[PDB]
């Protein structure tokens, strides 16, 4: 019989089993099958990979929505994501109708899907901009869709890089710390624009083991408190500037916090003879949790603290506020 | 009869003759024939350009090995290199199981080919991360795949 053979034809093009492929009809038991034929249209589509069992058919439109026993599909809509189409054997200018959402319309040799309303008149002497324009609700382009969309959004990891939705262990929230799967991973990390991860840094862990233009949320150590690492600004600078800071806080009459990481001679020897360090605990590093300034204690005449002195006499001209201070960590 | 009409079936998918498929079975000499057709899990697959003269077929295995005369043969390696693929009808949520390296596996619209051990048990509710990650010799996006690389290994030149 021609059931037989067309099954059978069919069940090649889909690289399924002769026994997969049904025929729609009412009543149809869809269970078990992989693929439903539409003899009306001559149309054939994949089924969802999990229909109930002793689910029955009921109706099947022009585009190509199935309705069953357990609900309903669309199967136009599921050949796209699995990128099973019919390419017409027209284009926008000789013109065509659509009818589905895996049909595909040729303009200069690509394709075009259509995402909008259906069915879709396409006019003679037509192009994909004048009959309804190329946006994710209209005109598609269906050759190369991922990656056309990946280079349109800057998805694409800078080469060496991974992308942080491949890694191992990650999980794209505000709330997972990423920290330990992120390290575990021996390669760089692209974080994409727009996309933010919580990684709680330590602050021994090197923040170039992130690429891209995301952002990092990261925990205080001491305090609850959290901080927003920029990986752009890391990666590309920030463009910011000492004096342009300074400048602007004393315009501003904002306060300008001015931290100096460095070794003895910035630590404050010999600013004055009783000159100390700072606290550092057993590992030799700054003690944290901390209320220490070094500014009112050994370290109050170091070259930075007369940096200050020079700044505030020139803010005294404006105000008496003090908005210039020194967070001087450096330990001889 | 319905070897014929399957011949014709496969021969127009994969744009040969009629005369150029062959069923496998065990002495099946293979000169000649272009596509072979396992009518046990109802699979074909193309064959290597150049078998020797008077090579006969001894077994084909499921993830597509073929064992002749004068060698053997990964068919579903040799696929992936003419990218012919079977695009399961599951997902890495719904689950699957792998037993070819030309099967694709979908996530979110995007399809996958697996290239490490077979058969590849996937569960319920996975994700190409979950079940294996994404790596050479894993689970290897199969959409775009030449300038995937192209663009992660900067082998694209500048324009001019
Ligand atoms: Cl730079
Ligand atoms: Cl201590």
Request: glycine share 10%; charged share 15%; net charge neutral.
């Amino acid at each position: 019989t021609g059931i037989l053979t067309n099954k059978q034809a069919i069940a090649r093009h889909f690289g399924v089993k002769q026994s997969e492929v049904v025929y729609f009809s009412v009543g149809a038991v869809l269970s078990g099958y992989k693929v439903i034929y539409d003899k009306g249209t001559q149309r054939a589509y994949s089924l969802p990979a999990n229909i109930g069992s002793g689910v029955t058919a009921i109706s099947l439109s022009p585009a190509g929505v199935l309705v069953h026993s357990a609900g309903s599909v669309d199967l136009g809509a599921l050949a796209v994501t699995r990128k099973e189409y019919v390419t017409l054997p027209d284009t926008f200018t000789s013109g065509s109708v659509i009818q589905t959402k895996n049909e595909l319309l040729t303009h200069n040799g690509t394709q075009y899907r259509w995402a909008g309303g259906l069915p879709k008149s396409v006019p003679l002497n037509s192009t994909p901009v004048s009959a309804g324009g190329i946006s994710p609700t209209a005109w598609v382009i269906a050759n190369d869709e991922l990656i056309r969309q990946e280079l349109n959004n800057g998805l694409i990891p800078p080469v060496g890089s991974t992308s942080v939705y491949d890694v191992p262990g990650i999980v794209v929230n505000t709330t997972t710390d990423n920290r330990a799967a992120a390290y575990a991973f021996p390669g760089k990390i692209f974080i994409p624009n727009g996309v933010t991860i919580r990684c709680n840094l330590l602050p021994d862990d090197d923040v170039r083991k992130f690429v891209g233009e995301g952002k990092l949320i990261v925990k205080n150590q001491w305090y609850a408190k959290d901080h927003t690492f920029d990986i752009a600004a890391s990666m590309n600078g920030n463009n910011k500037t000492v004096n342009d800071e300074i400048y602007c806080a004393f315009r501003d009459q904002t306060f300008c916090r001015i931290g100096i990481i460095g070794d003895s001679i910035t630590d404050g020897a010999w600013g004055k003879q009783d000159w100390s360090s700072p606290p550092t605990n057993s590992d030799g590093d700054l003690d944290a949790p901390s209320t220490y300034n070094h500014s009112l204690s050994g370290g109050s005449h170091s070259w930075t603290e007369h940096w200050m002195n020079g700044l505030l006499l020139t803010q005294s001209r404006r105000s008496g506020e003090t908005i210039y201070q020194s967070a001087n960590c450096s330990v001889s």
